[PDB]
Design an enzyme around this catalytic site. Structure first.
Site, PDB file in Angstrom:
ATOM      1  N   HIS A  56       4.356  19.723 -15.878  1.00 29.52           N
ATOM      2  CA  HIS A  56       5.166  18.530 -15.634  1.00 29.52           C
ATOM      3  C   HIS A  56       4.939  17.949 -14.249  1.00 29.52           C
ATOM      4  O   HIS A  56       5.577  16.944 -13.898  1.00 29.52           O
ATOM      5  CB  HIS A  56       6.662  18.835 -15.770  1.00 29.52           C
ATOM      6  N   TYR A  83      -0.669  24.717 -23.824  1.00 27.60           N
ATOM      7  CA  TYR A  83       0.418  24.287 -22.934  1.00 27.60           C
ATOM      8  C   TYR A  83       0.425  25.068 -21.610  1.00 27.60           C
ATOM      9  O   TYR A  83       1.394  25.742 -21.262  1.00 27.60           O
ATOM     10  CB  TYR A  83       1.757  24.394 -23.657  1.00 27.60           C
TER      11      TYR A  83
END
Ligand SMILES: [Ca+2]
Ligand SMILES: [Ca+2]
Ligand SMILES: [Ca+2]
Lengths: 316, 5
Positions: A231, A157
């Protein structure tokens, strides 16, 4: 809990009535025994201790305002289970019918939702940036898709692998939204974001730049915020997926669309057969080309369209 | 932190 399977009824965050699978033993619990090893929904009671208490209700009716986020977390987890089983022959997020657990009413005014490695967690929002986040089917399916990723590719991540992780969640969140077929679109979070503002969303897959996200590799973010832009740079992959499905011309590069179902097949195969924890964007392109080759053939339109889409967003 | 950063 041990009990008998029952069917309750309630209203979700947006005011829509739906039936929910419950379990009766003294109380009616948000425990759906009809899917795998169960879907279980919990009350975090505005605290941050997890999971909280398995949701108990005296009468099997879930029409109170406090009930609404639990109704939708429970119901949309069921829809997401059904999508993975019926479309991809995958039994829950681990492929072995693992129980799906969700907690609602997490913290106070909490403007987020997340898969934590073990379960789903939903804030209520502060009523201005968000209303309770389980009201968005794309939100529920996006975060449950992180569980699928955890058990398959395991994309770390951060940086490019993290942006792929995020994009995979936006892609399947959107494909689940289309599967349920209630106001589907290529936007993310529109049903729960900014109740005072019409027509917006958190991110757009069709035009990531509408919300400041890059739609081409030359516009990627390389700073440290947001785990290296997970994001933000997801917009580059989201745009490629949108182009694969819907087609279009982007920065002068034309893409022949192949439709949502084939997009889902290609990316599901890439996620489960080719991606690794450290895959970057270039490796995602190769994984998608190979997946489309497996499914449709090396000379297929599907393979050609995957290449065009990644070309259009500058990923070689 | 996961639907948004
Ligand atoms: Ca929608
Ligand atoms: Ca949406
Ligand atoms: Ca809004």
């Amino acid at each position: 809990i041990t009990g008998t399977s029952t069917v309750g009824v309630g209203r979700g965050v947006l005011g829509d009535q739906k039936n929910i699978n419950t379990t009766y033993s003294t109380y009616y619990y948000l425990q759906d025994n009809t899917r795998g090893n169960g879907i279980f929904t919990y009350d975090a009671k505005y605290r941050t201790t997890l999971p909280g208490s398995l949701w108990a209700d005296a009468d099997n009716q879930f029409f109170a305002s406090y009930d609404a986020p639990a109704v939708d977390a429970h119901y949309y987890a069921g829809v997401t289970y059904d999508y993975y089983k019926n479309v991809h022959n995958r039994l829950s997020y681990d492929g072995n019918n693992a129980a799906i657990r969700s907690s609602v009413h997490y913290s106070q005014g909490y403007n987020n939702a997340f898969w934590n490695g073990s379960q789903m967690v939903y804030g209520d929002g502060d009523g201005q940036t968000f209303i309770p986040l389980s009201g968005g089917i794309d939100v529920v399916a996006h975060e449950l898709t992180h569980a699928v990723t955890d058990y398959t590719a395991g994309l770390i991540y951060q940086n490019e692998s993290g942006a792929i992780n995020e994009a995979i969640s936006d892609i399947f969140g959107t494909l689940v939204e289309f599967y349920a077929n209630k106001n589907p679109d290529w936007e993310i979070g529109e049903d729960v974001y900014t109740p005072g503002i019409s027509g917006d969303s958190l991110r757009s897959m069709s035009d990531p730049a509408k919300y400041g996200d890059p739609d081409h590799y030359s516009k990627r973010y390389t700073g440290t915020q947001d785990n290296g832009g997970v994001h933000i740079n997801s917009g580059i992959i989201n745009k490629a997926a949108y182009l694969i499905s819907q087609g279009g011309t982007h920065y002068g590069v034309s893409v022949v669309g192949i439709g949502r179902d084939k997009l889902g097949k290609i990316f599901y195969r890439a996620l489960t057969q080719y991606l690794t924890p450290t895959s970057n964007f270039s490796q995602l392109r190769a994984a998608a080309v190979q997946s489309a080759t497996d499914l449709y053939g090396s000379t297929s339109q599907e393979v050609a369209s995957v290449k065009q889409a990644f070309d259009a967003v500058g990923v070689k | 932190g996961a639907i948004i950063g």
